[PDB]
Every structure is written in C-alpha cells, then in structure tokens.
Design a protein around this motif. Sequence first.
Motif, short mmCIF file in Angstrom:
data_model
loop_
_atom_site.label_atom_id
_atom_site.label_comp_id
_atom_site.label_asym_id
_atom_site.label_seq_id
_atom_site.Cartn_x
_atom_site.Cartn_y
_atom_site.Cartn_z
N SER A 1 -6.08 1.66 7.38
CA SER A 1 -6.57 1.48 6.01
C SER A 1 -6.99 0.02 5.83
CB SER A 1 -5.51 1.85 4.98
OG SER A 1 -5.24 3.24 4.93
N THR B 1 -10.73 4.12 4.91
CA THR B 1 -9.75 4.77 5.76
C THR B 1 -10.43 5.27 7.03
OG1 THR B 1 -8.26 5.42 3.96
CG2 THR B 1 -8.14 6.66 6.01
N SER C 1 -1.87 1.19 -4.48
CA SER C 1 -1.81 -0.14 -3.87
C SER C 1 -1.50 -1.13 -4.99
CB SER C 1 -3.08 -0.41 -3.06
OG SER C 1 -4.21 -0.58 -3.91
N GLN D 1 -6.09 11.81 -2.36
CA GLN D 1 -6.68 11.79 -1.03
C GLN D 1 -7.06 13.20 -0.62
OE1 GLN D 1 -4.47 8.28 1.35
NE2 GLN D 1 -3.18 10.11 1.10
N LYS E 1 1.28 4.91 0.19
CA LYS E 1 0.51 6.06 0.63
C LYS E 1 1.21 7.39 0.83
CE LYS E 1 -3.20 6.45 3.68
NZ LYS E 1 -3.29 7.12 5.00
N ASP E 2 0.43 8.46 0.83
CA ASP E 2 0.86 9.85 1.11
C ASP E 2 2.10 10.35 0.36
OD1 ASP E 2 -1.27 10.15 2.80
OD2 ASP E 2 -0.18 9.78 4.69
N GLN F 1 1.16 0.72 10.21
CA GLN F 1 0.35 1.91 9.94
C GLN F 1 -0.42 2.35 11.17
OE1 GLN F 1 -2.99 1.34 7.35
NE2 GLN F 1 -3.09 3.53 6.77
N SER G 1 -2.18 8.10 -3.26
CA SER G 1 -2.11 6.85 -2.57
C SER G 1 -2.43 5.78 -3.57
CB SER G 1 -3.09 6.86 -1.44
OG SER G 1 -3.34 5.57 -0.97
N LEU H 1 0.85 -1.17 0.00
CA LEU H 1 0.00 0.00 0.00
C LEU H 1 0.88 1.21 0.00
CD1 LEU H 1 -2.56 1.44 0.21
CD2 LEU H 1 -2.60 1.11 2.62
N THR I 1 -10.65 1.17 -0.56
CA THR I 1 -9.83 1.43 0.61
C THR I 1 -10.67 2.23 1.60
OG1 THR I 1 -7.88 1.56 -0.84
CG2 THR I 1 -7.67 2.36 1.43
#
Lengths: 30, 229, 212
Positions: free
Chosen positions: C130, C179, B191, B183, B155-156, C123, B189, B153, C177
């Motif tokens: 997530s 969150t 995956s 986001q 992310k950010d 995480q 983000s 994953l 996803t």
Amino acid sequence: NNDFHFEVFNFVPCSICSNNPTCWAICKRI
Amino acid sequence: QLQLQESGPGLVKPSETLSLTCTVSGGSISSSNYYWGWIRQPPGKGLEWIASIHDSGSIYYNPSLRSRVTISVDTSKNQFSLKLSSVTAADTAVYYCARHLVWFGELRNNWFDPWGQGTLVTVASASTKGPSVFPLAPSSKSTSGGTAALGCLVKDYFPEPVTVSWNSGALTSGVHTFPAVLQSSGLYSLSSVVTVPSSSLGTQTYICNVNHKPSNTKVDKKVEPKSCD
Amino acid sequence: EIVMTQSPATLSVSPGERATLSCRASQSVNSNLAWYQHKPGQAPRLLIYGASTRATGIPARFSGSGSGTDFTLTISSLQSEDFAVYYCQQYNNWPLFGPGTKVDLKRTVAAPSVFIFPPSDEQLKSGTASVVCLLNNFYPREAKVQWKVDNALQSGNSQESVTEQDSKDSTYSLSSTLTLSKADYEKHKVYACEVTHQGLSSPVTKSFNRGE
C-alpha cells in the motif's frame, strides 16, 4: 395526517395534556 | 448536566433482533414527565424517529416501525432500551437515544433535547474481522519545511468503526483520521496521519492506538522512520 | 402524509456573512417546527423550537421564522465553528425530519502539502503493498491525484478519502492509497504521486525510489 394522532400511542398519560380538552378525553390518570 | 450514552452491539445478523440500551445520568428518569426515545440515521439518509417511552409506561411510536419495536424503561438503573426485530440491511444505521419532550399544552412540545452521541449498528450476514495496523513511516519524502508527516494504516477490518488515538490521547493536535473506504475485499480500511515538528522525529515517540470494538482488538504500533538504505 | 423538503441541499458561505436557509412542508404544520444542528461526530443539538423560539443556550445569531408551509433558519455573522448539517423537524402529528442541508465554509484558496509513504516492511511480508500520498490542509475540496509507477500511470487501483471540513481553518485533507501486490511492487522502482489543484500554479509530484 395532522392534528394529533393519539392512535400512535399505546395510551396517553393524563400527565402531558395540560388543558388540552381533546387530550383530556382519552387520557389516563396514573 | 443531563447526558445520554448508548451502548449496544456494533454487529447483528439479519433475521434477528437488535437491542440497544441508553444510560441516562445527571438526571433521573423517574419521576419525570419526559419521554425517552430513539432516533436512527442510515448512512446517507435522513433522520427517522422510532419510539419513545414515558415513566408511566406510555409508548409513543413511529407507526411505520411500530410492529417491530419493543421499548422499555428500567427506572432503577436509569436505563431505557430498544429492541428491533427481524432486522434487514435497511436497519444498519447510527442509533441515537434522546430525551423526548412531549406536551399538548399551549405551545406544543414534540422535539428531542438533548441527544446522545449515536452508536453504529451494521446488519451483516458476516463475521467480525479485526484490523491489521501498519506504519506510515516518516522519510525525507514526508517532510515539508520543519514539519513531518507520519501515520498509521488500519486495514481489512469489519464492521465499522475503529477509533484511532495517538500516544494514548496525549497527541491530538495535527491529527487527521480519514473516513474509512470500502475495499473490493468487502472490508474497510482507514489511515490516521499526524503532522509533527520534524526536529522531534528521533526524540519523541509516536504510537498510534487502534481500537476495533466489535472484535475486542486493540493494537498499539510504534511509528519509526523506515530503514533508509 | 407529510413530507419535509429542504433547500439548498448544500450551501457555501463566507465566514461572517449570513446563511439563510429553508424547510418546506407538503401540508401545513402551523408552527410545530424545530431545527437541529449536527456537527459531524458530535450529538445533534436543538437550535429552535416553536418555529421561532431559540432553545436555552443558543446564540442570538441563529433565528427561525416562518409558518404553515414555509420556514427559514438564518445564521447571521456565520462562524467557521458552525460548519455542519442542519435538519428541520415538524411535529404537527409526530416527529418527521427533513433531508438536511450541509453548510460549508468558504475561505481563500490554500495549496496542499503533499507527503508520500512507501509500504511497511511488515505489510510486504503479507502479499500486498500500500503506497500512500497525502494532501494536507488545502482548499477547495476538488483535487486530482494521479499515480505513476515507472512513469506508468495507473487506473482503478487507488482510493481516496477526504476529511470533514476542518472546523477551525476550514480546510480539507486527502489520502490516496495505491494498492499493489508485493510482486509487482518489486517489478518497478519509482513511485510517484502527481497533484494538480487550484492552489498550485502547476501540478506537483512527490515521489520516492524503492529503498532510497
């Protein structure tokens, strides 16, 4: 706006004019 | 065989200049009767041609961009470059370099064959942020039949793009890397998931290799089943 | 000022039939018209130039016809490989491209496989959880994915992304996803993903409890 705007070149190189007579008017040998 | 490769910054701040370079290989730019050009494609818009340059120094311009374009050729390093001034968000796009066949002969020649693979430029008032990479752990809940799903994953991060490979390129069958989503934070983000034989879970090692070029971030994350307690 | 349109914007085509496809120009362009093929993530490729002329290395299944204002690119015996976007380009005065038309493939319906992933412990150290739910190798593209936490349905806290139509088996994959924050991921215990779709006779629900 069709029929070859040569105005959008800076100059036209004689090398891609073939036999096109109008092309050969503006172009420039190098 | 003739090949073109763009290279240039993923990220450029507005009110500044964007410069890209194409490195042509497998053929020489000089001497050659071919123009060399750049085409760009903004996200969810058409292709727009920008400018081309001929070994002779003749430059063929899209007029709507001419005032902002500087395009040059370095015949020795087999390289032509594009510089685009005072960029805005209107300039975020995938920029392709191409060979431009111009001819005013019998049968006109005004096309691009062949192309490079594009490079994404982003015009953003912001700062690069590298991704955080988290494992998408296999479980009884990520199996169907004798096949198991696992993944990473990413992310950010900002800006695009990231590349994801599995086992440093060894594993490429069953891999699905999804398009990034924006986001609410303003960052992207993504995956990546792969399906593998579940018989192999405890025995084959599955590592995801994330590369976020605009921040020299490289991450390798080993993906093991989550402590099941 | 010239202006290139294409129709239809998008086109679904059975594997094997012919996809007939068009470009139109505001003023006339004689036969100064090329066509490009652009598979996703790959480089554009010149198919035809001369409005009819097949570039070297191009199968005879792809032919161009037309003139002045109306052109047509046709792909006989369409393959799954051919899935991409096709742009036309007029060169009467200078290079102008059309908007493009996306050529999708049809195939038999295929139900998704549904997998679910709980959040990484790593995480949760950070303050966010997530949860991912994955639909793998289905058709067609339309699919409803609803999240439920403690049989409590959710809204606005999920995102999806779908892959490009697979060039081999013509399917799609999707990831949703959900969150949350670390805190309210702990105030609840059952995380479920419900899938509804044309390949399923009834919706299907993959779910896990926290910590097994």
